[PDB]
Amino acid sequence: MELTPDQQTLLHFIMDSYNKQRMPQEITNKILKEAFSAEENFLILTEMATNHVQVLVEFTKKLPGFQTLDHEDQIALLKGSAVEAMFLRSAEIFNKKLPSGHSDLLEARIRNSGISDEYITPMFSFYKSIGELKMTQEEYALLTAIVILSPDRQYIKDREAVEKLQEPLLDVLQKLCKIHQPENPQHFACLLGRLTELRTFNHHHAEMLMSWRVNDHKFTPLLCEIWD
Amino acid sequence: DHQLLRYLLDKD
Ligand SMILES: O=C(O)c1ccc(CN2C(=O)C3(CCN(S(=O)(=O)c4ccccc4Cl)CC3)c3cc(Br)ccc32)cc1
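^ thats the input. predicted complex w/ 9LV below
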């Protein structure tokens, strides 16, 4: 029927942190103005990818309990969720935030950046599949928090501490499905489908970086350090 | 190692 005052408080903190994301004006202006070349298109995308890492960290820091975790486990969670959080935020932006005209130029830039179809095809396939679910802002925010507070990421020393933060988010998300979609009992199951679909992007992304060499304009030293 | 993530996490 309704969220408990404690669940409402937890949801508000995640919503507030999630709603802080705002695509910078200089990035939006570049999508419109810059030359339509593989080199210029790839540079725009690298800047967007780098900007997402800063957005992710700032969002994560405000997640209830994140700051209470061991410092090395905070790093491990950020590193283990970076790719997954990026594709999820990208799916939200592509289906909601960006206007039809600029989304079209951004899609044109992505499709003409030098990146292989082996990575572009599952990317847009996932955006369409996310779009079908007509996710609310509470659902995107909670799914993002769930993705980041994953207890099974590599190099986590205290997994029980992370499970204690992830379990109440899964409880709130399932409750929100029961309140807002009481006619569709499979709504929560569809959202879980996106968690497993997002996991497939870790491999796709790792291979994409491997395809990049020093001789090519695609070599991104900073991003390659954050992604391993 | 993890110098950028560390800096961003341990700032403001
Ligand atoms: O507020 C900000 O500053 C900000 C900026 C950015 C994002 C998210 N976002 C992305 O990161 C990309 C996806 C990955 N690609 S990419 O070119 O495919 C690539 C590049 C390098 C390494 C791997 C990958 Cl997959 C770059 C752009 C993207 C495409 C859309 Br549409 C919407 C969103 C996003 C969120 C917030």
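Helices of chain B lie at 3-9.
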